[PDB]
Design a protein around this ligand. Sequence first.
Ligand SMILES: Nc1nc2c(nc(Br)n2[C@@H]2O[C@@H]3COP(=O)(O)O[C@H]3[C@H]2O)c(=O)[nH]1
Ligand SMILES: [Ca+2]
Ligand SMILES: [Ca+2]
Ligand code: NA
Length: 130
Amino acid sequence: IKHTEYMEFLKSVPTFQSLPEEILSKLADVLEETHYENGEYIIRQGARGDTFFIISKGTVNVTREDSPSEDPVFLRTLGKGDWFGEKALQGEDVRTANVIAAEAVTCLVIDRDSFKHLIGGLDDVSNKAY
Ligand SMILES: Nc1nc2c(nc(Br)n2[C@@H]2O[C@@H]3COP(=O)(O)O[C@H]3[C@H]2O)c(=O)[nH]1
Ligand SMILES: [Ca+2]
Ligand SMILES: [Ca+2]
Ligand code: NA
């Protein structure tokens, strides 16, 4: 039943609606569901990463420490259907920002092996810029 929940969810996200359903089925087979509570760091800037995240429940805050700043600066809030964690899967594997849960959060987490085959070629992901 979870495979179906995942498929139905992925087919509702515009970025992933562009993917053939057999590719979505393979993502649904391999993804892992992870759960967070408010204030929990999902990603820390400076860590080395290998996973991509799609928010299926809740919201997160994104912050980043820039070289000429002392303290991390708030960037944006993401919610259900949004995704993050792609930069460490594009080239160098370093995380470039913090991502912190802002309530009860569920993420669908995709590993590097699956991302590089099934997601990384999507233009919305490969050409993402902030
Ligand atoms: N550097 C940077 N990253 C942003 C930004 N907004 C988001 Br969401 N992010 C996401 O935060 C993630 C942290 O891990 P990552 O560097 O692997 O990918 C990042 C992006 O998906 C941004 O303005 N700058
Ligand atoms: Ca790594
Ligand atoms: Ca492409
Ligand atoms: Na990178």
